[PDB]
Design an enzyme around this catalytic site. Structure first.
Site, PDB file in Angstrom:
ATOM      1  N   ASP A  78     -38.246  11.373 -11.308  1.00  0.00           N
ATOM      2  CA  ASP A  78     -37.385  10.501 -10.500  1.00  0.00           C
ATOM      3  C   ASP A  78     -37.707   9.010 -10.694  1.00  0.00           C
ATOM      4  O   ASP A  78     -38.863   8.591 -10.518  1.00  0.00           O
ATOM      5  CB  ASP A  78     -37.534  10.866  -9.028  1.00  0.00           C
ATOM      6  CG  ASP A  78     -36.389  10.388  -8.172  1.00  0.00           C
ATOM      7  OD1 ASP A  78     -35.472   9.680  -8.656  1.00  0.00           O
ATOM      8  OD2 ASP A  78     -36.398  10.759  -6.986  1.00  0.00           O
ATOM      9  N   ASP A  86     -53.445  23.992  -9.185  1.00  0.00           N
ATOM     10  CA  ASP A  86     -54.623  24.447  -9.921  1.00  0.00           C
ATOM     11  C   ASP A  86     -55.134  25.812  -9.416  1.00  0.00           C
ATOM     12  O   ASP A  86     -54.589  26.400  -8.453  1.00  0.00           O
ATOM     13  CB  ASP A  86     -55.728  23.347  -9.993  1.00  0.00           C
ATOM     14  CG  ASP A  86     -56.422  23.081  -8.657  1.00  0.00           C
ATOM     15  OD1 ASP A  86     -56.465  23.966  -7.786  1.00  0.00           O
ATOM     16  OD2 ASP A  86     -56.956  21.959  -8.484  1.00  0.00           O
ATOM     17  N   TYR A 123     -51.247  18.912   1.129  1.00  0.00           N
ATOM     18  CA  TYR A 123     -50.817  20.266   1.477  1.00  0.00           C
ATOM     19  C   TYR A 123     -49.503  20.205   2.237  1.00  0.00           C
ATOM     20  O   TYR A 123     -48.628  21.031   2.001  1.00  0.00           O
ATOM     21  CB  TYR A 123     -51.851  20.985   2.345  1.00  0.00           C
ATOM     22  CG  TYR A 123     -53.120  21.406   1.669  1.00  0.00           C
ATOM     23  CD1 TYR A 123     -53.120  21.912   0.377  1.00  0.00           C
ATOM     24  CD2 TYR A 123     -54.329  21.367   2.360  1.00  0.00           C
ATOM     25  CE1 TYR A 123     -54.307  22.347  -0.221  1.00  0.00           C
ATOM     26  CE2 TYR A 123     -55.520  21.777   1.763  1.00  0.00           C
ATOM     27  CZ  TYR A 123     -55.493  22.267   0.475  1.00  0.00           C
ATOM     28  OH  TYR A 123     -56.645  22.674  -0.135  1.00  0.00           O
ATOM     29  N   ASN A 133     -54.176  19.646  -9.056  1.00  0.00           N
ATOM     30  CA  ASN A 133     -52.833  19.795  -8.487  1.00  0.00           C
ATOM     31  C   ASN A 133     -51.939  18.598  -8.749  1.00  0.00           C
ATOM     32  O   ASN A 133     -52.396  17.443  -8.703  1.00  0.00           O
ATOM     33  CB  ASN A 133     -52.949  19.995  -6.976  1.00  0.00           C
ATOM     34  CG  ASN A 133     -53.981  21.013  -6.606  1.00  0.00           C
ATOM     35  OD1 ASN A 133     -54.999  20.718  -5.929  1.00  0.00           O
ATOM     36  ND2 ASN A 133     -53.760  22.198  -7.023  1.00  0.00           N
ATOM     37  N   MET A 143     -53.806  14.881  -5.722  1.00  0.00           N
ATOM     38  CA  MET A 143     -54.573  15.031  -4.502  1.00  0.00           C
ATOM     39  C   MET A 143     -55.825  14.174  -4.627  1.00  0.00           C
ATOM     40  O   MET A 143     -56.593  14.309  -5.592  1.00  0.00           O
ATOM     41  CB  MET A 143     -54.978  16.489  -4.308  1.00  0.00           C
ATOM     42  CG  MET A 143     -55.858  16.717  -3.080  1.00  0.00           C
ATOM     43  SD  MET A 143     -56.565  18.533  -2.977  1.00  0.00           S
ATOM     44  CE  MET A 143     -54.947  19.416  -2.325  1.00  0.00           C
ATOM     45  N   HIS A 176     -31.732  16.160  -7.644  1.00  0.00           N
ATOM     46  CA  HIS A 176     -32.377  14.852  -7.528  1.00  0.00           C
ATOM     47  C   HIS A 176     -33.172  14.783  -6.228  1.00  0.00           C
ATOM     48  O   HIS A 176     -32.622  14.969  -5.128  1.00  0.00           O
ATOM     49  CB  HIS A 176     -31.290  13.783  -7.565  1.00  0.00           C
ATOM     50  CG  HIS A 176     -31.822  12.392  -7.540  1.00  0.00           C
ATOM     51  ND1 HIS A 176     -31.071  11.318  -7.111  1.00  0.00           N
ATOM     52  CD2 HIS A 176     -33.034  11.900  -7.893  1.00  0.00           C
ATOM     53  CE1 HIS A 176     -31.805  10.220  -7.193  1.00  0.00           C
ATOM     54  NE2 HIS A 176     -33.000  10.547  -7.659  1.00  0.00           N
ATOM     55  N   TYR A 193     -59.166  19.237  -8.401  1.00  0.00           N
ATOM     56  CA  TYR A 193     -58.177  18.194  -8.112  1.00  0.00           C
ATOM     57  C   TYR A 193     -57.170  18.075  -9.248  1.00  0.00           C
ATOM     58  O   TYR A 193     -56.730  16.978  -9.614  1.00  0.00           O
ATOM     59  CB  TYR A 193     -58.865  16.859  -7.823  1.00  0.00           C
ATOM     60  CG  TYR A 193     -59.748  16.937  -6.598  1.00  0.00           C
ATOM     61  CD1 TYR A 193     -59.205  16.850  -5.316  1.00  0.00           C
ATOM     62  CD2 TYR A 193     -61.123  17.104  -6.723  1.00  0.00           C
ATOM     63  CE1 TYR A 193     -60.025  16.935  -4.177  1.00  0.00           C
ATOM     64  CE2 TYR A 193     -61.958  17.172  -5.599  1.00  0.00           C
ATOM     65  CZ  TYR A 193     -61.399  17.074  -4.333  1.00  0.00           C
ATOM     66  OH  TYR A 193     -62.212  17.128  -3.222  1.00  0.00           O
TER      67      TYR A 193
HETATM   68 NA    NA Z   1     -33.844   9.245 -11.979  1.00  0.00          NA
END
Ligand code: NA
Ligand code: NA
Ligand code: NA
Ligand code: NA
Ligand code: NA
Ligand code: NA
Ligand code: NA
Ligand code: NA
Ligand code: NA
Ligand code: NA
Ligand code: NA
Ligand code: NA
Ligand code: NA
Ligand code: NA
Ligand code: NA
Lengths: 140, 141, 140, 140, 143, 141, 140, 141, 141, 141
Positions: free
Chosen positions: H62, H26, H112, H132, H72, H18, H130
């Protein structure tokens, strides 16, 4: 010290002793696999002649065998090999035997011998059958 | 303890046991390739006599064999003199009463084969030819 | 758990299984060279009896073989006394009903050959000659 | 050379130079964690006194500092007896005329901080509490 | 044979070589055990719960009496109301060895807990399915 | 994916291909020595049954051999009950209609030699009689 | 150069020489165990045809042997269709006049043995059976 | 399990917990240098969408943060179309009701810096710029 | 090339560039701990003079600093003769016009801090007074 | 693909991404020490121009900065001629319209500091001083 020799190869040449062999591998040669148990030094941007000249400035060829340099024989059926004369000419600079110091091995026998080398130098030499085994002699 | 022995070689000499061998390699010997499966200790600035003297101060020669020291025999047709063999005999005599009689020999290629079984190869800078010496460790009683 | 056993040896003893061997090496034994492919544990300040006693508290001897403990025979012409062999027999009898009948022997060079197969070599400082012991693990 | 010193520790003692420190760790000491960036030598079957006696035979204590030996101070309120401090002072006196005047101390956690800088940590089996000692090497 | 069967040989080595003040983490199934434990020894125990691991460890691992709270839990994220019955299980297991029982257990805010866990000697990656079942243990003295 | 399988074992099970073998070793088995050239996964707190059950959820048994599961033969005198064999047969039957017929055996020392060739040895804590089991992976069609 | 080839595989293909072999392993192949002494490159999301097509743009097939590509023969009694064999022959035909005649075969277990000698095993996700292919590198 | 995930990546996804992060890099991203202290998995023949789709089948995003996926931001002055951002939103929506709202962003150098802390970097061959994406792992309840 | 230089040190001397430093450590110097992040070459049987002589045949001293050789300052109040300093000055003079003027100094603990930054530490057996020497490599024109 | 590039350097050039830097080190440069945390590739028999020419055939220079190539500034007082700078400008101009305007510079010690951050250091045999060049990788569109 010849400028083309990297520090790792200078170390290798110095730590080799009487009877140790190195291989100057041409661009076609399976240098990494044959040299899997050896030290493989990359010299991809260089030909066989300049490598041999550089090595011979610091590496004596064995006088305890008649033919301390070994070429690969052409496969039966198989091109011109002027680099063999270059090799002979370079050896003649240091060793009176010249071309008589160069022997040969059939292709698969050559591979077997090469797997026993202390060091394989992976050249970018484009001429075929430009592989050369050198056996180190004594420093007196 | 002889000043010339580096810490790694002191450790090697201590961990060797009865029957283990080390090689004092001359400057022409292929120490790195022969010792590929052993511990290779560089001693390039020292000669064979100086090394042997130092080793013998801390290393008992095996009494369970007749000849715990082994030289390399000259190749047929090679007539180079070998006064270093006599230097070595003198050094061995100082520690072992057997003297020169504790020194045996092996044909060149047989010597290489035996050296490949050594626990440790000491790469000396000895300029004399045939100045290689295999030593077999004895017992601490 | 005997205090003299270092964490690494406890791990070794726990991970050995039925049939695995360990060597208690005396002070003269070539423990590092023989143990090149084994785990070598240094116990230089300890005698063979102390080490054996400690080991046997946690290590069952194999009942699937006659003689799970092995001594090194004296070489021909060597007349040295070996009272430690009785000490070892006494200690083994504390843990195994076979006592001295659990102990066999190997000629010196055959002993070295067998010891090269051990999982672990324990390098003792035992000053007595012929104080080496190979032990084979039983079932828990 | 003391029989109890294993070959690795002999190497360590020789390669240490002027100002290098080693730690004789008691059995309760976190030798592996404190020594994570050092060489940890196991001596689990040996007491602090035995180890100190052996080391001092080969290891000169630094004369370039007031207190080349260092003990761990008792945690405030921990009233446990420390007879081993007098044992250590006696052993030090045998090799160095400074004796007990060569021994300083550090509060528990400051001791851990200093010990993290040691070249070597020797993990003893000493059962006495506060039996740790830092030793700093002198000149030969 | 007094040693719990579930402890693998590597963990036995770890438990023995830890000394006074060293910490280990019993990580629940959701804990980032491998990343937190990057500079530590991580032992996988994926098939085992937190209680059975704690019970086994306490048979061989003395809890530190030089601090008041040698066991540490992770505090619930504010607003997260999930039940945490394993906290009382842990207290019971500790009480079997140490009279302080639940009083030996402190806590740290989530991110502070991660920071402390990064300092552990060993992280044990359990398969404990309960949330907030992480437990830091600090080793005491063998007198 | 069964919870008891650690990430490393999941990787192993996925990496294995047709003909690869794994060993479920009991508590007495010399797992580390036998698996010195293999991947040894510790599962000390787990029984042979629960491990086999988990593996078979993701590991097909080889149909290119008659007996892709292998037990160790009993010591010649031994008449002890081997209830775990029936447990294993039952678990195999859930995935493979061959059930008990898919289980072969090898003499003790031959079993060890085969185990040395396994890709992975799982070191269980199994105490049941004659609980070592070799499994050979089949094809995914 | 083909987008699908990762940097490590580019390096492998460049460092292979005359006679070196690589294996394109289908999804069912034991790529990690067979390639234990080789370089294994994962290509799990790619089929056999896609990979072969990419490789052949940069990898010359050996002319010093008649059959530089090798398939696995079907187990006797295993009558499963193998249309991928035609896919492969087609792709080979694009670079090499010999086409299907450049493909030989090995019995299943012989194939595994020969694959253990490969320099590199590429672990594809090819779902077809008998989709393994050994390729032998020629000269440049 | 999606077929494109290699064994090592399966292991990686299982051992993340977690709050751990991974980066889908990319084709232009400095994946090896950014990932120098992480696990870098090569997926050069695959695009960002297919990788994200595959990962989301086994990786919960999450819920303890508002925006568990991070893009990015375009460098100020860099006028370029980024249709893959909508692709990513679509794929996330399949698994998480937050959809596009679960996606946040970081300025290039901040991105980064965050990526250097990831557990794993997946080096895709995605040619879209872009493209990533940082993903943060959630809880398995 | 002087015979005392082992192959590893030849490699070191060759791969050093402009500004790189090496330490010639005396017999009492903590060469292994100071050199923990460097390459430490054992030369236990040799003196500071002979090592310096050998190095200087292959190693140009930096002209971009005034004092490319650095000695350790004596313990305050120590008036012991330091004959090796003159030996060092002479050997430097053979290659470099600055001679003794090429030699500077550092207080003991500052010297250790600088030595920690060296590319290579050579562990000599030198017993002469204040024999440690740091050398900084110059240019090959 | 230029013949002089060894397999390892090909892999390096492919795995570098946007903003990663490599250093073409001249023969005087401390390539090994500066490159301690980088990949150091030896090219001792090759000059700076030859290496730059080969690299630019496969390595796009960054357009997200004005000056993606960086030279080392001459030490004040060092007035040595630097014709290689024009060679470098000419080679860059073949690929990038910025030509010499794409080349910036750093003071010597600042150059060393920046070079320590490089992904890869190429150790050339370039005999000219101040022939070091840092290159920053751009995007592939
Ligand atoms: Na969660
Ligand atoms: Na000769
Ligand atoms: Na010789
Ligand atoms: Na003897
Ligand atoms: Na013995
Ligand atoms: Na038994
Ligand atoms: Na303590
Ligand atoms: Na002193
Ligand atoms: Na306590
Ligand atoms: Na099958
Ligand atoms: Na297959
Ligand atoms: Na060809
Ligand atoms: Na200069
Ligand atoms: Na430079
Ligand atoms: Na760009």
């Amino acid at each position: 010290i010849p400028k083309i020799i990297p520090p790792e190869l200078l170390k290798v040449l110095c730590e080799m002793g009487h009877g140790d062999q190195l291989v100057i591998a041409d661009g076609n040669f399976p240098a990494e696999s044959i040299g899997k148990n050896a030290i493989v030094v990359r010299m991809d941007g260089h030909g066989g002649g300049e490598i041999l000249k550089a090595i011979l400035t610091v590496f004596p060829l064995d006088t305890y065998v008649d033919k301390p340099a070994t070429l690969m024989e052409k496969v039966p059926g198989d091109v011109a090999t002027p680099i063999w004369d270059v090799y002979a000419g370079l050896i003649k600079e240091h060793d009176e035997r010249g071309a008589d110091a160069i022997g040969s091995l059939e292709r698969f026998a050559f591979y077997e011998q090469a797997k026993n080398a202390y060091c394989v130098i992976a050249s970018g030499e484009s001429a075929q059958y430009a592989n050369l085994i050198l056996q180190k002699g004594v420093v007196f």
